[PDB]
Amino acid sequence: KEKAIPKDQRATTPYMTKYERARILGTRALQISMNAPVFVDLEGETDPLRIAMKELAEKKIPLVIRRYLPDGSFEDWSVEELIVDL
Amino acid sequence: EFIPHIFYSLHQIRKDPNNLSNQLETLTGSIRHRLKL
């Protein structure tokens, strides 16, 4: 647990890349398509990808991204606190 | 200070309306500046 960086000493970008966005959407779409509970008010949609986008819009995806520094340490960022461009 | 400046600009308005529209517009802008501040 020595690798983990304290929250105050986080020196990575506070925006989320396109790769992280695509990975998160894919994971959430798979979990929804495997009958996982939905955290938002579904309105007439039957596609897991669109419901994943909808959950992302209200920032309700309960996932955490771990970013690997080259030496081996890592930095943990919640999906709620990552700024997503539109 | 805005009070004496408002007074003075008021008086050269009321003394010389025959000034070209440029001076009138600029001076009214000046009064708008003083009352904005």
């Binding site: 520094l69 080259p70 030496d71 340490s73 | -």
Partner: protein, 215 residues
């Protein structure tokens, strides 16, 4: 006054100025006036009645500035000596080595004209911690560092090296490297395991700083 005399005198004066520039660049104390000494004063001082260049009187001792001592506490005085013989014999090299050792100098510069016998250079690494470096005369006429394509290099202290290594979180075997025989490395006199910083121009950002290690 044959033309070869003044040709050799001018080339020797050029080499002297270049060596002074190098010693100044190594962190030592050299005045600007001494660097810009006109060739007339050089002829007046370092030539005999026949115009023969008296190289033996050009040997001099230099000391580091306050700033260099503050940045490098281990830095010490330097001595530079010229050799009159076309080829350096074993006895001359031994005499120079003994002179350096008895003066207790940490480093010395030995400029030779044409060639050095192998037995003479056998004694180069035999005096630790002193360092003996040789510079062929034909290669010091023109200052390399004054070219347009050569960026400006700086030497780094132990503290600065440690701080950079920590901040980028690296091990010294992953940085880009620079050899020993590299002309700028000889100019600056970099040893094994020393880090040199480079400042360069760039079409995209104006200025850019790189680093390298001497391997």
């Amino acid at each position: 006054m044959d033309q070869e005399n003044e040709r050799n005198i001018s080339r020797l004066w050029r080499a002297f100025r270049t060596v002074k520039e190098m010693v100044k660049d190594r962190g030592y104390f050299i005045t600007q006036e001494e660097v810009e000494l006109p060739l007339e004063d050089f002829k007046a001082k370092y030539c005999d009645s026949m115009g023969r260049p008296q190289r033996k009187m050009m040997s001099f001792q230099a000391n580091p500035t306050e700033e260099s001592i503050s940045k490098f506490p281990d830095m010490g005085s330097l001595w530079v000596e010229f050799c009159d013989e076309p080829s350096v014999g074993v006895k001359t090299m031994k005499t120079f080595v003994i002179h350096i050792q008895e003066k207790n100098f940490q480093t010395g510069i030995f400029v030779y004209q044409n060639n050095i016998t192998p037995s003479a250079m056998k004694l180069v690494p035999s005096i630790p911690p002193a360092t003996i470096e040789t510079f062929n005369e034909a290669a010091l006429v023109v200052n390399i560092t004054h070219h347009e394509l050569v960026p400006k290099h700086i030497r780094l202290s132990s503290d600065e090296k440690r701080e950079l290594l920590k901040r980028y979180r690296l091990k010294e075997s992953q940085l880009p490297r620079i050899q020993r025989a590299d002309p700028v490395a000889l100019y600056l006199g970099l040893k094994r395991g020393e880090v040199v910083k480079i400042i360069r121009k760039s079409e995209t950002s104006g200025r850019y700083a790189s680093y390298r290690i001497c391997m």
